């Protein structure tokens, strides 16, 4: 589900991934949103690459990283899987997801004037 | 539009609106008053 990552703040528009083809005029700066649309894996791949130690083992380590944009995973990888790590961020619930019991439990904070359009 | 560091309403109809990240002074009666931060 790397296609469904979420950035905090306005990083989708502000964060820029810079690369150079090596040729004159080959400097390419692409925002996070554009990079995500192009490659649904580049953002997470680059994050892990930057966090890994900057030595010769880094690409060997990356060979052990398997990124998949959506829920589908190759069957052999699925059989290989051993453990599932807890998600680092707990996804907040939406109103559509909140149960009516929870809504009732949460108190009404104010008395809206009866004669108001709203 | 004229680029200004300080936006000043010139007539009554000049109005300040924050659009696309920055402040603007718009004016229908005198479009000459158009200012951009």
């Amino acid at each position: 589900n790397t296609r469904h990552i979420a950035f905090s703040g306005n990083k989708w528009e502000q964060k820029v991934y810079s690369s150079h083809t090596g040729y004159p005029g080959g400097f390419r700066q692409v925002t996070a949103a554009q990079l995500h649309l192009r490659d649904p894996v580049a953002i997470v791949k680059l994050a892990i690459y930057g966090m890994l130690p900057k030595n010769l083992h880094r690409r060997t380590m990356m060979e052990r990283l398997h990124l998949f944009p959506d829920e589908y995973i190759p069957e052999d990888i699925l059989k290989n899987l051993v453990e599932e790590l807890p998600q680092p961020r707990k996804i907040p619930k939406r109103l559509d997801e909140y149960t009516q019991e929870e809504i009732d439990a949460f108190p009404r904070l104010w008395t809206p004037p009866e004669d108001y359009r709203l | 539009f004229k680029n200004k560091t300080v936006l000043k309403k010139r007539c009554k109809d000049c109005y300040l609106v924050k659009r696309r990240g920055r402040w603007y002074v718009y004016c229908k009666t005198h479009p000459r008053h158009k200012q951009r931060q």
Binding site: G9, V16, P92, K93, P107 | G21
Partner: protein
């Protein structure tokens, strides 16, 4: 709450309106937030709290009507903007990148092409400074800039 109905002939009818829950924890408080002891104890994702000050189409309600403080109205407005941008109010809409804690409208921020040097870095704002004084259970304060 009064609603206008047409048939042309148009008339306004007052319908059922919710009432504040009985027994506020802190009666004789300035704003509802203070009355219910929520001064620094709500965030952008507390939709149950936020939606109580929201028009059916997502717009905020006026401070005069809500009774909120100036600062609390500002905080609620910013939190509601963040919740809308995070998609936590799918039913309050005027009529695909996941986000949260987005201070600015997505269409008004330019890419940070040239982040300055280490001592003058251009940082990406996260959250809102209006919530700087929220209760912090962590050792480090909230980082409003990334």
């Amino acid at each position: 709450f009064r609603e206008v109905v047409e048939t042309t002939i148009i008339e306004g009818r007052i319908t059922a309106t919710p009432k504040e829950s009985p027994n506020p924890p802190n009666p004789s408080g300035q704003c509802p937030i203070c009355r219910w002891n929520l001064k620094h104890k709500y965030n952008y994702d507390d939709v149950l709290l936020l939606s109580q000050f929201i028009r059916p189409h997502g717009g905020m309600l006026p401070r005069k009507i809500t009774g909120l403080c100036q600062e609390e109205h500002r905080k609620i407005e910013e939190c509601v903007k963040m919740a809308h941008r995070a998609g936590l109010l799918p039913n309050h809409r005027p009529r695909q990148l996941n986000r949260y804690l987005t201070r600015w409208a997505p269409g008004s921020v330019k890419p940070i092409y040239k982040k300055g040097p280490r001592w003058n870095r251009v940082r990406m704002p996260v959250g809102s400074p209006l919530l700087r004084d929220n209760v912090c259970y962590s050792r480090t304060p909230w980082k409003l800039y990334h």
